[PDB]
Amino acid sequence: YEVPKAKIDVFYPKGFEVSIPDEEGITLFAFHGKLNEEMEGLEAGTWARDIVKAKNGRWTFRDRITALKPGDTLYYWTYVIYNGLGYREDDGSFVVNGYSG
Ligand SMILES: [Zn+2]
Ligand SMILES: [Zn+2]
Ligand SMILES: [Zn+2]
Ligand SMILES: [Zn+2]
Fold first, then answer.
1. What is the CA(87)–ligand 1 centre distance, in A?
2. Which ligand is closest to the CA of 78, given by its number?
3. Alpha helix (H) residue ranges in 25-66
4. Ligand 2 centre from 83 Cα, in Å?
5. C-alpha 27 to ligand 2 mean position (Å)
6. Percent helix, strand, coil in the chain (nearest 5)?
7. Which of 33, 46, 43, 45 is nearest to 96 (CA)?
8. Among 2, 74, 60, 71, which residue's Cα sits nearest to residue 28?
9. Which class would CATH give 1-101?
10. What ranges do the domains of the chain cover?
């Protein structure tokens, strides 16, 4: 199984969203992230959230408070339970280059 690569949308003045599409057999998505500093292994990070449920065909993490700027880098890893087994998107990095809304 391959965890879908997370889609990251950054909002102005603040907030961001991290999501993946859902499919049969996924029962959890979790996001672990840090800003402008690498994750040290599979640590919890600054943001560590298990998304409660899929909604509208996606699993979505939403931050409403953090003001990201162009050139900021989000470092992250995600976890999915697929058919009862755990899998990750490892070594995620996203450089903010622009806003979605
Ligand atoms: Zn892989
Ligand atoms: Zn289907
Ligand atoms: Zn740490
Ligand atoms: Zn976790």
1. 9
2. 4
3. none
4. 14
5. 14
6. 0, 50, 50
7. 33
8. 60
9. mainly beta
10. 1-101
